[PDB]
């Protein structure tokens, strides 16, 4: 399942209302309608087993599907051979049918491709009987009922309303993601009430009623419906501020570096907003390509500005073939592209 977030990035002011979206390639909803009640199902099986019956377990454990399947094969095996010839042999046949139906109903309840919990329910280990051919062997099933209820608690569903297997996370630079909202709409303990989520099927949304300083971060949507779990590409909430043109500075290579056979020429764009800026290197008015690298800072904590460095790298020889070194800067704050130059000979 592919998750698409929109917009990928945007600038907002404090006190603003923010709505970010998540679009899934296929529905992340499961369940609803007509249930999985671990308490009731287990309590019913426990009663039947005590009416029918040290357990000899096998060395090899099994998954929940293999465990349930073995007890269904066991239940069907006795039924196949049991011939009712008395009131007691008819009552044990009826109880065997009640057990077979209860095991099949737990099995069909969890064993289907759609079930978002199946793979995680399958990591659990169940103990198998060494031999299961007589009614006494049901003691092996009884002992494994408590771990069975603990696994069924993962697929617990009471109610006709559907569930959305979709979560929202907040991530700040260098920090781990932090859960904000689970199952499309549930606010996580401690999360400010200004955060909310809604949606169903394929369309999900996250809202911040009045943006605060601590809310500028990247937000990720995440689906839990089908393996492998996937994340959206993220939405980065940037702080909006007034347009600021960069203070451009150029640095020639040091003599120390030139002496070693390399010339790094640095253009600095200082304290600008927005982030969008075009830097072009010109050597004797000829546009340079593929010998430059850029680096940009994150938004300033107080100023909300960016700074950028652009480095043109040349060999001492290529550097000494030319005189004028220029960096042409294009930015929204600038009416015309600003050029900063130097002549190789000071």
């Amino acid at each position: 399942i592919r998750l698409t977030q929109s917009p990928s990035s945007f600038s907002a002011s404090t006190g603003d209302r923010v709505t970010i979206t998540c679009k899934a390639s296929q529905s992340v909803d499961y369940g609803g309608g007509n249930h999985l009640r671990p308490r009731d199902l287990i309590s019913n099986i426990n009663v039947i087993v005590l009416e029918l019956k040290m357990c000899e377990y096998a060395d090899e454990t099994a998954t929940i599907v293999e465990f349930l399947n073995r007890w269904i094969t066991f239940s069907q095996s006795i039924i196949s051979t049991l011939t009712p010839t008395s009131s007691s042999t008819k009552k044990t046949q009826l109880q065997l049918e009640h057990l077979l139906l209860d095991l099949q109903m737990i099995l069909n309840g969890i064993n289907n491709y759609k079930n978002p919990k199946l793979t995680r329910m399958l990591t659990f280990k169940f103990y198998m009987p060494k031999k299961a051919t007589e009614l006494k062997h049901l003691q092996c099933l009884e002992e494994e009922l408590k771990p069975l209820e603990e696994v069924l608690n993962l697929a617990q569903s009471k109610g006709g309303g559907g569930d959305s297997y979709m979560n929202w996370y907040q991530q700040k630079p260098g920090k781990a993601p932090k859960l904000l909202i689970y199952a499309a709409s549930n606010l996580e303990s401690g999360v400010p009430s200004r955060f909310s989520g809604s949606g169903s099927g394929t369309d999900f949304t996250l809202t911040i009623s009045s943006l605060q300083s601590e809310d500028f971060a990247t937000y990720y949507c995440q689906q839990s419906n089908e393996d492998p779990y996937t994340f959206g590409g993220g939405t980065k909430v940037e702080i909006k501020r007034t347009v600021a043109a960069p203070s451009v500075f150029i640095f020639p290579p040091s003599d120390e570096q030139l002496k070693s056979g390399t010339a790094s020429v640095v253009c600095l764009l200082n304290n600008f907003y927005p982030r969008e800026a075009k830097v072009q290197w010109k050597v004797d008015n000829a546009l340079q390509s593929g010998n430059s690298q850029e680096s940009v800072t994150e938004q300033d904590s107080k100023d909300s500005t960016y700074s950028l460095s652009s480095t043109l790298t040349l060999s001492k020889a290529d550097y000494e073939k030319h005189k004028v070194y220029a960096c042409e800067v294009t930015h929204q704050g600038l009416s015309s592209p600003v050029t900063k130059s130097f002549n190789r000979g000071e």
């Binding site: 369940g31 454990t61 978002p116 919990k117 793979t119 995680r120 399958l122 990591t123 659990f124 280990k125 608690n153 993962l154 617990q156 569903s157 569930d163 297997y165 979560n167 996370y169 781990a176 993601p177 932090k178 859960l179 689970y182 199952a183 996580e188 990720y220 995440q222 839990s224 419906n225 393996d227 492998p228 779990y229 996937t230 994340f231 959206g232 590409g233 993220g234 203070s247 500075f249 640095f251 020639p252 290579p253 040091s254 120390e256 570096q257 070693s260 790094s264 640095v266 600095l268 200082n270 690298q293 850029e294 680096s295 940009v296 800072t297 700074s307 460095s309 480095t311 000071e346």
Partner: protein, 216 residues
């Protein structure tokens, strides 16, 4: 009180093996599933696999099957992510996360702090530090070039000069080596009074350079 603590940053070469760890505390480690998530620079998050600490039961994203092994040691509340032979494509930030799966829940409530894995054939190399000489506010700086691995620390006048400093993120050159610049804006007339020194430290190579930046 619930926490997941991950092992430190790793710097490895292609074909090397690696095992990273995730230790739980403040809760019963055996009762909750532990999952591994990777994040690459620029790219988002990808799920890798899950361990059931109580059983040793695992499941992998088909994309990483055969490349990684997830394991756990119940007795020491620790989960592991292991590679037999690292690739350049394994360079990422790795998180371990606690899975909450009761009823309709299917979410990650507790996260490890992250472990960075850097896969490169480069060897430890200390930087060369060059001045960025200033020509009413002047800009001056230092070019910290051709070092491996990250990080480098850059300060000005032994950290006493902080106002107007910008130490740019490092860029990985095609050589396999990193490079960065640290710049500072100062009052124009201070250039003929104040001495400006950039202090560069690269712990892996034990490089400690104090580069005086003079007007020119």
């Amino acid at each position: 009180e619930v926490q997941l603590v991950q092992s430190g940053a790793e710097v490895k070469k292609p074909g090397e093996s690696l095992k990273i760890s995730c230790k739980g505390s403040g809760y019963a480690f055996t009762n909750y599933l532990i999952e591994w998530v990777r994040q690459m620079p620029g790219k988002g998050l990808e799920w890798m696999g899950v361990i059931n600490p109580g059983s040793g039961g695992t499941n992998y994203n088909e994309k990483f099957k055969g490349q990684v092994t997830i394991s756990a040691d119940k007795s020491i509340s620790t989960a592991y992510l292991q590679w037999s032979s690292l690739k350049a494509s394994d360079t990422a930030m790795y998180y371990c996360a606690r899975w909450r799966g009761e009823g309709y829940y299917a979410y990650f409530d507790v996260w490890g702090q992250g472990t960075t894995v850097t896969v490169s054939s480069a060897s430890t190399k200390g930087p060369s530090v060059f001045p960025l000489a200033p020509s009413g506010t002047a800009a001056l700086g230092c070019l910290v070039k051709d070092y491996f691995p990250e990080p480098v620390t850059v300060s000005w006048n032994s950290g006493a000069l902080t106002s107007g400093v910008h130490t740019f993120p490092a860029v990985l050159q095609s050589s396999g080596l990193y490079s960065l610049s640290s710049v500072v804006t100062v009052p124009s007339s201070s250039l003929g009074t104040q001495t400006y020194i950039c202090n560069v430290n690269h712990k892996p190579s034990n490089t400690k350079v104090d580069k005086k930046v003079e007007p020119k």
